[PDB]
Nucleic acid binder design. Sequence first.
DNA 1: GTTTTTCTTTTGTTATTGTGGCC
RNA 2: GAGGCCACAAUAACAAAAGAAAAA
Lengths: 406, 543
Amino acid sequence: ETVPVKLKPGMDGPKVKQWPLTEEKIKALVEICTEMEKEGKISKIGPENPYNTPVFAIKKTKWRKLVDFRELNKKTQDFWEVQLGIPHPAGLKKKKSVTVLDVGDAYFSVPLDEDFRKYTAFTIPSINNETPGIRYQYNVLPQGWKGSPAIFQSSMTKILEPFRKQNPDIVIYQYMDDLYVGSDLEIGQHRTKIEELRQHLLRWGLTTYELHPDKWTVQPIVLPEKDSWTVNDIQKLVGKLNWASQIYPGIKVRQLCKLLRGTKALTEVIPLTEEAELELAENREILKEPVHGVYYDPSKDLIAEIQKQGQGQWTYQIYQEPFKNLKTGKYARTNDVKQLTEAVQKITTESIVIWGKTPKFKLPIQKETWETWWTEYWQATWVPEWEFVNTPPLVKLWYQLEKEPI
Amino acid sequence: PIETVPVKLKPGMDGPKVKQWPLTEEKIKALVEICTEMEKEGKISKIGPENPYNTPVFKLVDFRELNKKTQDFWEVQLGIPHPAGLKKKKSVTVLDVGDAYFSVPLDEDFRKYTAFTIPSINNETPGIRYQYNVLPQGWKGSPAIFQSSMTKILEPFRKQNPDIVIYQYMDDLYVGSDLEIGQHRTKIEELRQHLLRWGLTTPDKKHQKEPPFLWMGYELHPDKWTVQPIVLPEKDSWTVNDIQKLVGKLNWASQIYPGIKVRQLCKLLRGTKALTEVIPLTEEAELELAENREILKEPVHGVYYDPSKDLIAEIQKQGQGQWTYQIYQEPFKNLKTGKYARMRGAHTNDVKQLTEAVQKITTESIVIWGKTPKFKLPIQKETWETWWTEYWQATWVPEWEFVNTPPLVKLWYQLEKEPIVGAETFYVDGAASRETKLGKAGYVTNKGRQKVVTLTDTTNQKTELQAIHLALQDSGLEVNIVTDSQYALGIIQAQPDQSESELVNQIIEQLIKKEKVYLAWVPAHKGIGGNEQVDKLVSAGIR
DNA sequence: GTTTTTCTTTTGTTATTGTGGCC
RNA sequence: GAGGCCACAAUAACAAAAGAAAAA
Ligand SMILES: O=C1Nc2ccc(Cl)cc2[C@@](C#CC2CC2)(C(F)(F)F)O1
Ligand SMILES: [Ca+2]
Ligand SMILES: [Ca+2]
């Protein structure tokens, strides 16, 4: 049977333009979609259907089809969150090891509301615009729609209810096409409990690491320790601390700027007065202390910002209001675009578990260059929001000082 | 026998209700014979009072209003093929489908909206009314629906004959094979038979056109392509419209003629000015107009794409912010050429600007050929590497190699990462008025020197660059400078070879001349010694 | 004090004019 | 009844986008 879905009144359907694809990805996508037609999943459609959604070919072994339903999900957001949303388990972040595998095929056997299929329309392009472009639409629940979990949800609890009574200190949470299952078991005992669900799910037609949730710890800023200070060394420390005051208002620089009396030579060694050495150590203690006064709001979007910190290394922050970072961190290595895509994907996984939302990314990269190469290394089944920005130099210089774990 | 496409009106709209005006008795006499024929052939049908809609006779009928009211469709042949992505063929054939539109029937329920009226001459008695049974000429949906029919019809024939490429474009089919001309001519007639089963007619062998084929302004031969020759008129006086026409022709040629340039003919068109206003050519424009004239005297041609060889793109800096490129598979046989205008930002660096030219060409190459090229770039491999590892923006060019064709692209200067011992320390700053635009900028040094200048009709930021201009002008070949303007520190650490502002450029030349410069930043209004003395002096006048 | 005005290294839009074409 | 439509370009305009920054 089918769930009667509809869009809000002031909302047309999606009409996104399809980014050019390489010949190799077009050949792969043609193959995949004819096999999905032959199985009744998708249907060829006509020119009278004006809507469209981008299609890509990503790497998740043998080729896989990814549809970028971002614009459509915004257009059915009152449906899959208010009407049939999924609550978030605060407990999930606290397990010792949380693994997640692909529940993709689960959606492929439920019919999609007929009066709604027309929005799922997508187009396989053709090289050099030599053939009109292959247009399909969806007859079943599409991987990558947010409306798909909300519908198979009523059926999802019933698949998982036998395992949830049997093992009731393990948490199960599904975002999009993924099941996040959280355990405190040993590494041998985690790997046995996973085969338990891989055998349990083949009983409803569903084929099929991240030991991290207790390892995501916000590192402190670590100011330089020097036996002699030059007028330079203190001038730059002052500007950084002065900016970091927006984040930590306890930071003070007055006893340091007093030290810089008269136009000195940039190399001249200033001994730190006993007052100035106290300020520097009061500052150090503010930075080792966890930041305070920031609390996650659910009525607000997460934002993720990433700085190209240095060769092979990247700094990031997850925040909702400026300077109030709910997380900060360091990813280290390949090229820039490959690392960024892997960094974007790690942050989104982390951010799901912890809040069950994905953040809107601010990426330091020209848009066109991103559109060209991101599918070359993308592996996930969802696609976050993202925006293209520049990096203030003070922002990288500051977050450079986080302590890297060993 | 072609099944119709269901077509609807835009939500909440009714059909056209436009009044029909009277016409010449000679015009009324001619139309009635045109429609009486169409009615006999079943293209149109007489209608009566039951139909409330109407559209005026002009394409035979002017459907502006119906097109506004008709649903949108999905894009049809959005972009056009570029000849340089066609593969070489030994036999080509073009059939133009003649009764194209008349051969596809119109969705039965939609037909009522296409009604029109031939009025009578006296205009006291109502005239003859009709509506369309087939895709009307100039109806918004007619091109897309015909193409949908044609693609369905061509499917089996494509299935039985894989090695034949059929490209469809408007009313025309372009058919290509590597068969020998006789077997090719057999297949074409097989195609004609298959199309005729559905009522589509095409020219027989005696009436098919012989290559080369004119198409979209190209001239398509079986093994090469070209554009029709481009004549830039030679005139003593040029109007703004004249220069518009030159740039358009020149741009059109950019694809096959290497090294075309337009920037300085473009700079003339900058002033808003009536199309009739005579505009006198600058001499850089008079010069680069000439260089383009010589380029268009040569003959040129492009080859087609050989899917079994690597794509190669080679880029040369052709001048002031301009770039130029060629894409080939064989060393002297280019598939196409092109140019790049760039200058998105005021303060641009060549190294980056090249990377932009590379990103444009990478994208165009995926469109035309379905894969990315290999690059030949006038930039050394570690002049590239030092720039990008010290830049905040990420990028990626997967495969390029150095090619030594001057002018090479190089970073003009690089600023120091540590303070220069024994170089005079300068503290620089400026200040300017919020209302009167009077400002001052100057410096003091740890050696005791100091200087202030006065500036007019300026701003705080412009003055702050002037201050760094002072310190570099009046210091030795090694120098430390300390400023409070992150604005000014950023523009300089961008290494902009080309900038909109004349003043920015002059500093750049001064940084070439110095051979050690260490530039640093300290926050304003924090009483930092050195900063505080110069803040005092340069904020004196107005503050 | 929060709201102003200035610049730019990120993205985008509606209009004209021009080149090559079509219906 | 003041030709639509497509690609490409140039010019003009809104950037009320965004970001950062100065200044009051
Ligand atoms: O792939 C090829 N190669 C080629 C070479 C010469 C000619 Cl003249 C034509 C072609 C052809 C085409 C086309 C569109 C531009 C109309 C065709 F299919 F043969 F029509 O496509
Ligand atoms: Ca100042
Ligand atoms: Ca024209």
